[PDB]
Amino acid sequence: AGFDKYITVFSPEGSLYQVEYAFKAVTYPGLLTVAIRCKDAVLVVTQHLIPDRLMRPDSVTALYEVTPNIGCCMTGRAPDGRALVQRAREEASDYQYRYGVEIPIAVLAKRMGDKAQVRTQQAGLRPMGVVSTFIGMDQSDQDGSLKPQIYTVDPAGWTGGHIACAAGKKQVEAMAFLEKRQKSTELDALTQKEAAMIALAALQSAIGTAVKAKEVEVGRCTAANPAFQRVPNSEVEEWLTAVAE
Template sequence: MSAAGFDRHITIFSPEGRLYQVEYAFKAIKSTNLTSVALRGKTSSVIVSQKKVGDKLLDPETVTYIFPLSAKLGCVMNGSIADSRALVARARSEALESRHLHGYEMPCDALAKRIANINQVYTQRAYMRPLGVAMTIIGFDDEKGPLVYKVDPAGHYAGYLATSAGQKEQETANWLARKLKNKDHCDGDWKEVVETGIQCLSEVLSVDFRKNDLEIAYVAEDGIFKVLSSDEIEERLVAIAEQD
C-alpha cells in the first residue's frame, strides 16, 4: 500500500505506527493562527485567548473562542471553529446530563475524561474523522482548588499547572515553564493571574494588545465561570501598562 493510502484512512496504521489523519487534526489546531493560554492560580483558574475578526462585515460580538459549558465550567477552543462548536455542544450535553443524573455539577476532570473518550472513538471509525480542535477546560473544585485540563484530537487529556494551544503553543509553553519554575500555581488573585496570561501572549507574540484583541475568562473561589467584558479587559491592560 502506498503512503497516500495511510494518509486517507483513519483506521489504518502506517508501518511506523502512525495515524496520519490524527496528526493532520493536530495541524488543524494551528490553522487559525490564534494562541491561547490557561493558567492555574492559588484561588482561580484563567484562560486568555487571542481574538481576530477576519471580516469587517462580521459582528465582533458573534466571534468567540471561549464558551461556557455549565454554570461552573468553561473552555477555550483552538482550531476549526465549526468543529469547536460541535464539540462544545456535546460537552454541554454531557455536563447537563450528568447534573440531571447525579444532582450536582459535573467535575472538571470528569468532563475532560468524557470528552477525551469521545475523541478517541473518533479515531477508531472509518466513517468518522477526528475533530481538528483542542479543548482547554477550567473549573474550581472545593477540595482540589483551581483546575485546568486540556483534551486533544487523539483522546489524550491531562491536568496542567499552565498550558497553551494554537499557533505558538510551544513558545508559550516554554514561557510558562520559566514563569512557574519550582511553583505549582501562579501568584496572586485572579486579576494578577489574568495579567500573567496577557503578558505571556504579549511577549511571545511581540504584540501590544488592545481590549478587542483578547478574550478572557476565569473561575474563582465562588466556582462561577465568568467572561470578562471589553471594559474589564481594558482595566487589566492598563494595570499592566502602569507596572511597566
C-alpha cells in the first residue's frame, strides 16, 4: 500500500499501473498511424514528419521489415519499437530453422504478445512503450488463395486481428472516422485505390492539416506481389489529390 504504482503489482481495484502508464508512452510522441485492408491488399499509413530541416529524411522511419512477407509499423516510443523488431526477426528466423516454413502472421503476433506479458509480470522488467502493427497476407486453406491480414499487439499483450486500426495521438478520432465510413460500405469489398483514400483521410481528420505526401510514408502488401515494400512518394501524390476531390 506504500507505492501501489511503481512496479508490476496489482492495484486494490485489480489493475496494473505500469500497463496503463505504458499506453501513455504511445501517445506521447504525438504521432499517428492508420492501417486498413481492402479486398486484395493491406495498407499502413503513418505520419513521417521531421521537424528539423537538417535531418536526413530517409533514415528516420517507422516501417520495418520482419520477414520478406511481413512488415510492421511501430507506434510509440521509437527506440522501443526498434527493440521489438529485432525480437520479431529472431522469432521469424528461428521458426524458419526449426519448422521449415515461413511464419504465419497470426502466429508471429501471438509469440510477440507472449514476450510482452512476461515483461509485465516479472517485477524488474520494463514494458515496451510501443504498439506494434504486423501486417501481411496469409496462405488461406481449402482454396490456396492469399488473404489480407492486420494484427496489433498492445504493450500489455492483447493481440488480435483487425479490419482497420489506428495508433498514436488522437487515435480515438481516427477510429471514429473509420467506423463512420464503415456504416455505408463493406471494407472487404473495396479496392486498393478506394481503401487508400480512407486511410489517408482518416489521417487528415485527426491532425486537421491535410498533410503533404512527404509527411507520410506508406507500406503495402498485395496479392500479386506478396512481399512487403513501401510505396514511392509519387503514388502518395496520386492519392492525396483524390482525397481533395
